[model samples]
Target: AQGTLIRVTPEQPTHAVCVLGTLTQLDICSSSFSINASPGVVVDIAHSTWPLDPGVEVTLTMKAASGSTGDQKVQISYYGPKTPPVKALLYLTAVEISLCADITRTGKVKQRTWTWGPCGQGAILLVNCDRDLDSEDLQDMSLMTLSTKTPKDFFTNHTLVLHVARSEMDKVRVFQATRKCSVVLGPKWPSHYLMVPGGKHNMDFYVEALAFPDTDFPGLITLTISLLDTSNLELPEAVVFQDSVVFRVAPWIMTPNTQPPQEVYACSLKSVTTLAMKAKCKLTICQDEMEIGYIQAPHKTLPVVFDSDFGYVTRGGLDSFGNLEVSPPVTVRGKEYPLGRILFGDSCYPSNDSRQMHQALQDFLSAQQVQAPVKLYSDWLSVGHVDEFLSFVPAPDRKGFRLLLASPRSCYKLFQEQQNEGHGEALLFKQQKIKNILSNKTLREHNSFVERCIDWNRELLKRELGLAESDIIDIPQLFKLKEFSKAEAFFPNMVNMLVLGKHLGIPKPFGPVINGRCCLEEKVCSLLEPLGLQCTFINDCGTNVRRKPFSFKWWNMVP
Candidate 1:
């Protein structure tokens, strides 16, 4: 992950000095001048030719020497051109300061006392009484100076020395000023390392520290660092270090206290109606006849909402009102992990609150001890319920669970076998007929389209959950159009079964058990018995199952 960087600044000052002397008495010889008002500042100009041109280059050196404070050094490489002649008199036009001083002070003006202190403490008395005698008309000092609050607050203290020299024929004079300053002591380059999970295979780690202020002192300047997890739990322990620190991030998992929803027993004509009642779910009854299969329990609000009939709710974590939510960004151990809200689809509907819906779902899943919400693509599905294409099952002999999904290819193979046995010719015809009616394309093309959708879904699951191909189990199930019209039509799917511990409940089939045309209960049981699962068939009363003689309202129903 990208971390942020910052820099620190210290207190300092700048000053300037000027000389106003006549050039008539100046000689371009070994002349040196000094300012008596300012101490610890000195400048010297070496030999130069007479009748000095404005562009004559001269070398000068300035040194800021202090009695009790440290000194600063400056070397003037060359002197540049002077200003134009002024007032018919050659004024020493070169005006500049070469050195400055630093003074430390304490207390405000009214409370200040005239007392000398230690190098890093109070009451600055840089210059004592020196009389130039002009109180109101003295020129404002151009000496550079930096203001500071405390002396010991910084690491290094410094005072600058600037050199100024000029020669008008023979006269030579120099001026200097002193200003105080210091440098800050901050952390050095911080180093960090991390180990992230590839497929739920690893945890995360990280560490950082200050390199300088690592010395032992009275206060110690304790630094603390910690990682906050999705459950709001702090990892390891807060790191306390003066110089450097290191820590790790643990992978997030479902809380140990988390439990599955309670199982309720019910007997009714339509399985959908019976389950809805048992779950105490809210139903969105369409004006037309169709059974909705999708229901979810959102966070703190409604228990569940009927998702679809012509469609189905994409199974995932729900909001308070059972609205869809999706994942939020978080750090699990090392790499970024997405967790949080449930997500579904629908636009153009004024009543839907997309943002609020997600927020509620996030709240809901958090209460359930789940770190993240599940994501399901609904708009492109023949039916939206995640169960229509996917389910989670305990691995036959493994610690982790395995993904169960619908296999259209397996269904097609079964169709071929039935046709070879001379019992599925009519069923194949019905499939082809319906494919043309609904898709307006060849049967092969429609089959390919459906297969690709399932394939994409499988890839997404593997990518997000970091699962191997062997970790997913396929359920053989075929699809066909039910009737015509948007609200009345339905997709034939047998993989959309409900689970309760070791018990698997499936909706009753509409076709014969032998031809593999339907009665998927037998096929499902055969497939799961090896994995120690028991299957039961519920009488849906054909409420959600497809009827015979596929309808052809191709234009009205979704392809």
Candidate 2:
């Protein structure tokens, strides 16, 4: 930086020092300018030298010059203060002004309405007005004034609303008296203004007003000012005042009953069988109360019903509307199981309506003379349904059905068998895509928790259903990489086999085959096939099985 040795003077009683030369760099935070003057002489002009508004432009006159250039009356125009809005405006003499006036509905001026005045930064104002005064009269009063830099018809033909990023300053060509003309404060004032791309200097000011109109009852009016560059040729220097004033309608004046009437499904007594049967599928997978009819007549050509009571339905529908499990026929000797028996979960009863729902279900069962009890389980599981963990299967050597419960220990046995056969390491190696995954420590921890859940569930079945150890069948089911935090676990429940009269649909096992031998599938067939029960390995499209116990990290935490 270089500058000439110069003498400075103040315009009157004011002690403002004028330093001459072209300023090459400016520091906004410190409010200083670096200038290169005559050879071997560099100087800086700071706010402490001669205070001025941060963003205003000042013409500093040179009284004398030395060296190669002869003495000549010279002037250098430079920006005044280059700091933040609040700090810079503090050095200037600010005035309060407004853009609104109070007028009666008869189109007569009542009084001046200035809601806010002379706020440098962080100022708030509220404007309330009655509807419909003359638009032309309202337009005339919306002029922004600052010193001698007042712009008449400033917001002409433009909506006086500042939505900020819609700062279209290039359209208008009005001139103002100062370089720092207007300050725009929309919703995003200081936040959006800080990252502006050009010009080292900026400033802010506030204004507001209100007027009563003849057309509407009452409303709110606001005014926001923004400063932008202008290309108007009529002005000595390009200056644009970006300002907006908007009128909002009050909510109390809106008409009632603008909405349509509520609807009603009016119909007489009719059975679901009478409804038009659309189509049929190879296997109708049903859930909720609809599953009861399917269990009653599995061979009847009925419309396929897929429900959420089994945890395979829409999450929102299940969570809000709840679901019911239709009771399957339980034939012990000659007597059939209780009718009107239903099963549901926590999803069926929400908030204060839980007791009412249970009471209603109990009343309906009592009306139907149902002796079989209703079963309610925790829907906190991942699939959020009882069908995900429990099912009933025909006893291998008896006339009655046996309860099939999930057993993590049975699953662990298969896993240990695979390891004893030396195939476990190879399978584990293939799933080495993630670090610190499938360690022995995690496996033991996961298995221990699964054991606790299985034990607790066994106790629940025993106390609730009066099932003895011999009456319940432990199915070889296990969760893969299960998390203990939430009830979201992936499992393979081979015991979830569907019974459709003489035809039995069995879920395809996802058990690993070691040396071309699948122990899980083989064991299931040996247990059921010997009783002359025809089992079809139903391909659930790979949905019912989790092959590897460690397929995913606990709670998918690896990702």
Candidate 3:
């Protein structure tokens, strides 16, 4: 984040002022005379001695004052070496320059230096990823275009300005170096080098981030400016002053499952009405392999789509974004994760032979850093996903959230109690009897192993997320073997549900109906409703769940 210096000489003498007086009067060559200039410029000797040395070149110091505006003259009048000299004269004009940034978002607060931390100082840059329009300069747009856009069109940008209060802006050159993040300034330049045009007012630039910060690219990219002095033909222009501003590209953030989801996704026909009424704002059912995640910063938030890590249609289980999830804000080990933590299913258990989530996808989530990812052992299930047996719902508790695990043991225990209470005649799906479901020996065997799989993940989530058993809830669910002997949900999986604020979209688990209520629905409601969650059971009818909300309150941010 440090800037390099460029040595520059003064501007061309023909372009400036005079010592004033008769030519000979001003030309008397002696080093003992006093020097003066207009208040806008300061004149001093670099090596200030009472009388200047004749043999060595007399170095002089000249600069413009901070309030200095326009251009002013400097008069260097040299008098007396007394022994063999005469006073001489020279004139120079000091041109003013400054580099500025609108560091304060609400108003204009010009900051010359960019700093980090609690006193966070710098302008924010958005990753110009929204190609909703075919704007060719999408990578780099203008500050002017940003003004004409709507809030939704924010594809908007920050203006990092270069102000040359006086003289040639052509002499100013800007380049980007990162500890390196390629943040580029808009001008039609071929390389990173951009020259300030001849005009001199606010040279406002719209900067664009080429990539998200990763393990290799630090989040901050800087624009370094150099004001040059091209007075000497013997040398390259002396860089008179150097100025730079740091831009921290916003990180791709995730919305917690607990955020108020605005729309519904998946399943159709008559339920679309239910989903629309449920999700006040209507939702779209996504059919592509693309993944949608949001990126956030001060004053702006964007929903970025990561299409697919491999970017193609696939039939495998590992490349799905459906397996990826994030929890609601949680306080663990006393550190608050306002944006919560990322959770994804991966396989490294039983034997390492299990298929894992896409490596490219896993690396991307971890590199984002804000939500340090927690990988779980999910290969034990047929579909190999975390969504099948694990989820989080908001609560009014010390943790503000509770973990829900799909528990076959809890289901068996509930059934045992039901049968013992003479509800064996209870109809399932309002159809089959509970006695029949609990009767099959292989169903019991399949569920036994399914419980072990759920049990393994229970301990994993507890250890990594710093959860106590009290912080967890076991939702009643049963699993039976798939075609390959891989365990799949026997009943509609309730834990693979969607959270929208206090409302939950659960798959209708047509469990044994006793009295009048479906035991599965009644039981889940009893467990979750007390915590302020309302269940909306949809007849998933075996279309496995996908839980990225159609829209969410993505603005949850902490300094």
Candidate 4:
């Protein structure tokens, strides 16, 4: 207040006042800084004149501002007979401020309103889970990274910078306001207020995201940064400028088959089977049809999810989500589905007394509008799952992905072709030759029904996924009727293979051997090799018969 106390003499009728509070605080001298007077305001004011050493002088006091930075003014005059009035041109512009984001990943672009759409605008906060020597629970983004693995990249990355423009860097104290789902609010050490030191016109307040979106935390966490004025040393200070920014914590995106598998959970089961089998500790466990659902964000990874199902293994209705799979990002009609879509199976023949995915789960899947679900008729299968008949493989051509569907029609077509090519005596499981398989009327009858079910889903998918016949490649595989009606894989099914980046873990088809290679393997190679997939057929003999039979599991993604 003393720094702003400009001495006005009686003879010198007017004076331009300047208020300096801090080294880094905004300069109130140049701008039209204002106070007391705003929008038709009338308040307490008393006049008192006094004699000074040289001439008469008047003293007046002003408190710091508590509003957004804008134009304001105060006028002063003497009401006397001589009317030799003295005037003080007062300017109390609130410190200039705004919340900015490095949305483009290049520069701190000034954005307003936190818009969202195709050409969207908003702040990006990175989840600081990647630590080095520092394994921290203190969740503030910018600070924690200094001890992290790649602090340089993290700081120069998605960290949101609050640049207080036209502001006095000193008196302005920036406080992080939170919607408080689970927060990374700054308390210096752990709790509340955040203050950044140093100069230039802009003050930088770096904020890092603590939580990514989940079932508990639905992503759109709002963080309101409120700047307060502490200039009123003798008086109680108040909030001067406030701006709120909305942050939809980046989606827990699922990694597709195209991306190399980061880790192998089979290494849990993927690793444990070896150790447990050798040690006989039996310390390892298994899930019959573990409904493993993987999810991730910039901060956390997905898939390889240790889906907790072993404890009770109860049929928790919708809890059984093995058929769940999300496709790689795809465009359908004119709309772009960047998050892809959820694909699950149920009885499209609603009248059947069989179980479908619970209504509650379907509602949840449907309500989440972004990932519109694709329901397929899988009640016809022994296990009743979409994963049995359909999957996706990454490719260089159209849509960066190709839908792989198991086709009995294609399987029969291939077998007939093999017979025509004079390999009718080839062995499968050493139980049946190509001629014997083709000759089995019951197997053929079972296959016709299974093909009808697959074809039913094919048209359903083509319409739902907006694909043509070219987009889908029906892999050659057959199915057998089980317990009268439901179908199961006849051979170790081909489409129900595991995607390990470019390398595929395909179940050995044991198809008719022609020349040197199994025709099925050769056929799969011919179909997928041109698209950069390396087919590696492994003997997964037990998978089809021992446990939950058919394609009992869908894809599992990990972070």
Best by lDDT: 3
Measured with C-alpha atoms, the lDDT of residue 442 in candidate 1 is: 48
The order by descending lDDT is 3, 4, 2, 1
Per-residue lDDT for 350-419 in model 3, tens only?
Answer: 4546788767667767767667788887777788778898888888885778899999888888888899
Off by over 4 Å in 1: 1-261, 265-370, 425-443, 480-492, 515-519, 541-559
Superposition-based RMSD of candidate 2 using all C-alpha atoms, in angstroms: 27.1
Error of 2 at 225 (Å): 86
Higher-ranked by TM-score: 1 or 4? 4
Q: Which candidate is the best by TM-score?
A: 3
What lDDT is obtained when candidate 3 is compared to the true structure?
A: 0.57
Error of 1 at 489 (Å): 8.6
Global Cα lDDT for candidate 1: 0.31
List runs of model 4 lying over 4 Å from the truth: 1-73, 76-93, 97-113, 125-218, 225-241, 265-306, 309-321, 349-352, 358-371, 421-426, 515-517, 530-532, 541-559
By summed lDDT, the worst window of 10 consecutive residues in model 3 runs over 146-155
TM-score of every prediction relative to native: 0.35, 0.35, 0.70, 0.60
Q: Candidate 1: worst 10 consecutive residues by lDDT?
A: 242-251
Runs in model 2 lying further than 4 Å from the true structure: 1-289, 294-341, 346-371, 426-439, 480-484, 488-492, 541-559
Error in Å for residue 73 of model 2: 99
lDDT at residue 409 of model 1 (Cα atoms): 68
Give the Cα error of residue 58 in candidate 2, in Å.
99
Q: Residue-wise lDDT of candidate 1 within 119-191, one digit each (tens)?
A: 3312111111121312121121111222211122111222111111111101111121111111111132121
